[PDB]
From TrEMBL, chains A, C:
Domain Glycosyltransferase 2-like, chain residue ranges per copy: 6-168
Highest rank taxon of the organism: Bacteria
Pfam families attached to this UniProt entry: Glycos_transf_2
Role of this protein: Catalyzes the transfer of 4-deoxy-4-formamido-L-arabinose from UDP to undecaprenyl phosphate. The modified arabinose is attached to lipid A and is required for resistance to polymyxin and cationic antimicrobial peptides.
Name recorded for this polypeptide: Undecaprenyl-phosphate 4-deoxy-4-formamido-L-arabinose transferase
Organism: Salmonella enterica
Record bears the keyword Cell membrane: yes
InterPro entries with a match to the protein in the record: ArnC_tfrase, Glyco_trans_2-like, Glycosyltransferase_2, Nucleotide-diphossugar_trans
Reaction catalysis annotation: UDP-4-deoxy-4-formamido-beta-L-arabinose + di-trans,octa-cis-undecaprenyl phosphate = 4-deoxy-4-formamido-alpha-L-arabinopyranosyl di-trans,octa-cis-undecaprenyl phosphate + UDP
Family of the protein in this entry: Belongs to the glycosyltransferase 2 family.
PANTHER family: UNDECAPRENYL-PHOSPHATE 4-DEOXY-4-FORMAMIDO-L-ARABINOSE TRANSFERASE (PTHR48090:SF3), UNDECAPRENYL-PHOSPHATE 4-DEOXY-4-FORMAMIDO-L-ARABINOSE TRANSFERASE-RELATED (PTHR48090)
GO BP annotations, alphabetical order: 4-amino-4-deoxy-alpha-L-arabinopyranosyl undecaprenyl phosphate biosynthetic process; lipid A biosynthetic process; lipopolysaccharide biosynthetic process; response to antibiotic
Amino acid sequence: PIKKVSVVIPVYNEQESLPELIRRTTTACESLGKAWEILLIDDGSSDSSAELMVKASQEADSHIISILLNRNYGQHAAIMAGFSHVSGDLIITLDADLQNPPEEIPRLVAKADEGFDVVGTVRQNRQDSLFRKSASKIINLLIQRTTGKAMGDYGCMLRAYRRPIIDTMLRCHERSTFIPILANIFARRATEIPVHHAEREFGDSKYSFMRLINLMYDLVTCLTTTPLRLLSLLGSVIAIGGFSLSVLLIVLRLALGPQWAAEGVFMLFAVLFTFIGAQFIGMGLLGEYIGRIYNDVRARPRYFVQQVIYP
Amino acid sequence: PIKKVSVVIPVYNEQESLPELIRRTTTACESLGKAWEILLIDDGSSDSSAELMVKASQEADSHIISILLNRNYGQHAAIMAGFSHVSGDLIITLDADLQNPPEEIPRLVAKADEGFDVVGTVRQNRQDSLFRKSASKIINLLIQRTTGKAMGDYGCMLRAYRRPIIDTMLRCHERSTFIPILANIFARRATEIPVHHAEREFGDSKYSFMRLINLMYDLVTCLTTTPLRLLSLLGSVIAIGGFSLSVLLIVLRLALGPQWAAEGVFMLFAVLFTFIGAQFIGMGLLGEYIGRIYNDVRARPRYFVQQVIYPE
Amino acid sequence: PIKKVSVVIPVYNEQESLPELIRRTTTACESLGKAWEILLIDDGSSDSSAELMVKASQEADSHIISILLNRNYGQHAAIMAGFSHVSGDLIITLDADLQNPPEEIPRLVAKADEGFDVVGTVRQNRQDSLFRKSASKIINLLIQRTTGKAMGDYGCMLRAYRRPIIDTMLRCHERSTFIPILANIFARRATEIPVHHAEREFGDSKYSFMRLINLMYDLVTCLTTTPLRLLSLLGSVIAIGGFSLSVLLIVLRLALGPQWAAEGVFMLFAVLFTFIGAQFIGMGLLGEYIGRIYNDVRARPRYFVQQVIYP
Amino acid sequence: PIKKVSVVIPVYNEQESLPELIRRTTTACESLGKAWEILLIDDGSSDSSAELMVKASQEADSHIISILLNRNYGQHAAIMAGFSHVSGDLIITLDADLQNPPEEIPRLVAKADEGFDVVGTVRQNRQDSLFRKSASKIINLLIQRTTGKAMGDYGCMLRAYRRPIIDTMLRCHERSTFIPILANIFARRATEIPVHHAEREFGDSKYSFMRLINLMYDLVTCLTTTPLRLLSLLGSVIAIGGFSLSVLLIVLRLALGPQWAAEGVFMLFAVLFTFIGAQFIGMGLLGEYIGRIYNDVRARPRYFVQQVIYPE
Ligand SMILES: O=c1ccn([C@@H]2O[C@H](COP(=O)(O)OP(=O)(O)O)[C@@H](O)[C@H]2O)c(=O)[nH]1
Ligand SMILES: O=c1ccn([C@@H]2O[C@H](COP(=O)(O)OP(=O)(O)O)[C@@H](O)[C@H]2O)c(=O)[nH]1
Ligand SMILES: O=c1ccn([C@@H]2O[C@H](COP(=O)(O)OP(=O)(O)O)[C@@H](O)[C@H]2O)c(=O)[nH]1
Ligand SMILES: O=c1ccn([C@@H]2O[C@H](COP(=O)(O)OP(=O)(O)O)[C@@H](O)[C@H]2O)c(=O)[nH]1
């Protein structure tokens, strides 16, 4: 079933390209022909972006819904705040400074007619720092390993959500979540298509080094509790290494008395590493319990049954 | 009292031997004579296993109830997802590659007539990695120490649960639990019987080294919070040992100075070990609070009544 | 207001003195004159204690309510399990093997008529290990410091609770709690009286070294989250000690070159202590956050207003 | 819009200067001319402070509403307990020993006429321990960095809150919060004004060294979870430094061997530095997870709307 469509867009000091964005979005949604609404979310922009929001609000026959926040909460928080005041169904989330061509929105909607609950974009010809490209590849393989299904582009925010799934993510107790991955978790039928990607024209990058670390750290912590087990494994490796050094130095003690001058300090020094190993494995044990606590306080569903058959 | 019985079996990419498993389970249930249902749970198998589930569905007069998941959650999650859509009573959990002979299911049901709420299986002549056998023995002694009652083999998925106990597991908020251990905790009358063991045959084992570590960490976390207190005790031992060595070395220093050349650094090391021990103590204290958090978030019923009498 | 009284007693392999305990409790409650009920809780006793429970249940005109558990849960858990099936009001909790003379129960009830919500026993002439007496004194001063009121005897289990407060502790999300201290937390009007203490006659001590550590460790963790801050303080002390040693060795470097032969190892070893200190303060920071988590997951009330006055 | 106003004041053993405080507050409220109420909150004061509360109660035509607690919970808990039984709007929090002149209360109320939801006080010419002044400056720069908006002095209890915002704090499950910081987080329109500062005079300060450490740790935990990520960054720096030293020392060893006698222990120390760094990384990972635990157990509303418009 398809009804009133709503497109939710964040914005953060992007008033330079904003009027062109509004014109292109209006043209695309009018070309779609289905009844439409627009919800722009201001994340406490410094400049006169809220002023343009109010100006768009005053303009009659505009389906814009102006919402501005008291604080820069983070983008994902802004998409979620837009999710709070959704109307109709088939929520469309789009970039602010036209990094994603809005003209593609009907195609997603068209593919939304196929029946897929989640619609994603490949976003081909993506360009970034080569180290960041390698990080994207490794996190993509990690997320497809953990989830058991491959999803092309995580960083792309051009996505479509149905009303039931957006309600489901409204209900969840999670804070500081990653919208695409959480939506993919609550998916019955998902798909992805390629779309053209264009560089930022008037606007500049609003993701600093600290913001980059925060966003992919948030993504990795929202993904799984696996990395804590890695700490336990590293501790186990260090402990076995320390024990091997201890037994080798016992062999040396059985051998010539002075090894590398006085190896006496070495006799305790190696077991210091053993103690370090022990402390690391202790960290691992704590980590696993913390992981469990996290898995229980998120109230993540246990099984999401795809289908059931009776005789 | 015993009624309509249903058997819940997980599956993950076991279509190779699956039709023979279905035939043997149907034959065993028909030989039992009691009204029966079968529930296969697919954990998002890669191959055409869901296809065989649907094919069994269309088969006329089938008691199969095929349930398909959206992803590979893991085994215990699949058993509990099957537990969600159970009917009747005396739920029996089997394997997907005939490692446990299904022909033994009436015997459990027969012992279910005795009145035991949990009926476990002693796996006889079980063969595995000798290190893994030693790990099984140490976990068995740990669980019998903690529970105060010894049970044969926790690892066996062949087990029997009554409807009240399965409801008890259904109520809890605990994510990533171990079904047999939790059932043993929430038990009124438990027993165990020996059963023959067979290999995977055509099928292969799916539990890898990482999956083995994950599951045994899961079971130790689900059983008790004791190991954090064990860490605190180990830290206490290291701290007291370090302090004793420190005082002995300072006594030797006061007794004589020229006995060694660099014994000074020995006292320098003698304190840092105490620091390391003290650091472990911190771990212990931290751990205990997380223990409570765990005990507080899982919402475990503190007491369960074995048998209540109201005199009048 | 006063109605049907109930006395809840745990038991754990104490069938040797059990019949005499039942006779004395029945005599005392009959002497009280108020309508009475008795609830004995078996903590999975090995011997034929459940057999005596059933025998007492079969005996007509007995207000005993026989409840036995599937597992040795711990005593406090057994008192809580008795708390589950309470009837009437003024719950009386008593020791099993007559360490506390039951003949004093009406006096508590008599003082319960004064209006105090919580009734405690001093339990004078208490005898135990001198180290354990010192531990009792220090934990008593700690609990009176933390709570801001003094309460005589924590280890004494002869206590009286009203129905509202027992309902309050039933409602709480806490697991493995300490009944007397938790009751004192939810107190509007509390009091304590001295009572005679008698040694165990037929029964032996059922608290081993491991059980002793478990019980007072449970008490201290249920009391406050203060001990985690002690970790941070000791980390700060070790860090400042390491920094002092580092600056003294810099002074020595300014002084004669070789101090105690080669002090370069000392130079780096001081900063090793510095790193250890830093790690300990990290421990402290984690500890504080865990403390907060514990305080919020317990759902402990924030203020318990004693009284309000309007103009 | 501004209506009936109430002033909430904590107290803990401040009966020495209390009658003068009550007289000055009554005079200031009468000079204001708006309908007014006073709520004193006693945090289980040892001396006869509750007695003076009751005596003020019996006093005819008094707007005082005396509330007495069963124990010394602490300050912030007492302010929020007073927040429980508030009436009207524009709640003002004062001090119990006249350190902040009550005569300034109408000015806040006057600035409350401007429309600001939060009205804070700049405590001018404030004097304290120079180390504590430096601590105040560093916490101020930290909070203005995290919030993105600079506020004068967090430590001042003289502040103004509107009824919607006080309801917002009343709704949250957070135990042991810092009221001014939380109010600044849940703010629509905030401002600050300078006010004269006076000493405790007859009264003494109640915040001891342990209480100071407790409160500033409370405020840093209530503000942000940043310091755990700072610990992870410090660990990363130590790890990379240790690895660099290790590779430099092995390069020097390959270049020459007889340059030193015991350079071996140098590499031995270098690797354990890397281990220490890794341990700090472990702290970082754990603390981040605990951060999430903190965020989702406190149930903070992720977004708050400054101003919503529905075009039509
Ligand atoms: O704190 C922030 C930072 C960014 N954004 C949004 O994120 C967009 C960033 O767009 P883009 O993906 O083109 O930036 P890039 O990844 O190219 O730096 C901004 O326009 C905002 O709408 C936000 O809402 N809050
Ligand atoms: O990711 C997995 C792996 C296995 N299984 C189930 O667990 C069984 C494990 O089989 P088996 O006992 O033969 O392997 P083992 O435990 O001996 O390694 C499989 O047949 C499946 O039914 C599952 O549900 N999910
Ligand atoms: O695991 C346990 C241990 C003890 N108890 C109860 O604690 C009592 C101990 O009595 P007492 O205080 O006289 O022992 P003591 O402190 O003298 O060793 C037993 O009789 C039981 O009722 C229990 O219920 N569960
Ligand atoms: O345990 C305490 C200590 C203090 N206070 C309150 O906090 C005030 C602190 O006074 P002041 O600001 O003069 O002390 P400072 O913060 O300067 O140390 C007291 O008057 C009380 O109203 C409280 O509620 N509980």
